[PDB]
Ligand binder design. Structure first.
Ligand code: VGM
Length: 284
């Protein structure tokens, strides 16, 4: 059974994932999502400490937290469910929709990056859709694995006299960890546009570690011929092996594919519409 303190504010309903439960807030009769996590502590102390501090349309907000036998985390409820469900089993979203979704993905991740945060676990199932409309807001979720951006920094201005070699060498590449969420975005954009994974083991004898390190991804021109060159061009620039050359969230946001005033207009429209709920009258 659930804590008295939890049951006291919420009315636990059905299951949504596995675990995430649906619940109603007593005060308001509004639907919320409650994530349960059994005992560990580190990932949560931080996911909360992060979520609490974050503030963006395309990042999931935390509504409440319960430290008990297990951990209960109360979040905004995304009604469209996971993005994974939209692409699983070679389903595929129309390009215009991918641009819409990916644009928000870029905004969200750029946001984290501006704030010294690295998600590190971006997958189709950590992206949630605000409704069942395929014209909806998406939100990034699952900050369990996030890093937060100085060891080297200090080590640097000192006596390199005893400093091991490997550490100085580590400098050239230091400070580029975020590049890994851009990889992941790349992988995601691929699956979305095509229907299929860039590096799977379906019909191929080359290892998976080797497809990825090489950069050589299963490219099936039959499916891709349906997809624009502008789109695919971007996928290519995110799936760069060298992280220093890889596209950043910003370079991606400046890419031709994303200079599309309609998709941006639709996102606007979509934005304000969510905000009508909270719209405070303001000074004129
Ligand atoms: C179609 O209905 C479904 C909804 C959900 C669902 C709805 N809202 C959410 N906030 C979440 C959710 C997903 C991931 C996490 C995380 N990993 O921390 C937290 C909350 C899920 C899921 C399936 C559905 O069929």
């Amino acid at each position: 059974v659930y804590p008295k303190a939890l049951r006291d504010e919420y009315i636990m309903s059905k299951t949504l994932g596995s675990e995430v439960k649906l619940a109603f807030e007593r005060k308001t009769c509004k639907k919320v999502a409650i994530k349960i996590i059994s005992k560990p502590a580190l990932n949560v102390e931080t996911e909360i400490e992060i979520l609490k501090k974050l503030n963006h349309p395309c990042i999931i907000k935390i509504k409440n937290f319960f430290d008990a036998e297990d951990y209960y985390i109360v979040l905004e409820l995304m009604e469209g469910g996971e993005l994974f469900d939209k692409v699983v089993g070679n389903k595929r979203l129309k390009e215009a929709t991918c641009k819409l979704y990916f644009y928000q993905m870029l905004l969200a991740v750029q946001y984290l990056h501006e704030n010294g945060i690295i998600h590190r676990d971006l997958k189709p199932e950590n992206v949630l859709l605000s409704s069942q409309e395929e014209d909806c807001l998406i939100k990034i979720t699952d900050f369990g694995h996030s890093k937060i951006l100085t060891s080297l920094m200090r080590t640097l201005c000192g006596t390199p006299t005893y400093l091991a070699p490997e550490v100085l060498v580590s400098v050239g590449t230091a400070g580029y960890n975020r590049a890994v969420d851009c990889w992941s975005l790349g992988v995601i954009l691929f699956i979305c546009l095509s229907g299929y994974p860039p590096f799977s083991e379906h019909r191929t004898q080359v290892s998976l570690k080797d497809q990825i390190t090489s950069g050589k991804y299963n490219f099936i021109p039959e499916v891709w011929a349906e997809v624009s060159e502008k789109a695919l061009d971007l996928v290519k620039k995110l799936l760069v092996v060298d992280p220093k050359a890889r596209f950043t969230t910003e370079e991606a946001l400046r890419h031709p594919w994303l200079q599309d005033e309609d998709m941006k207009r639709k996102f606007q429209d979509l934005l304000s519409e969510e905000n009508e709920s909270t719209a405070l009258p303001q000074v004129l």
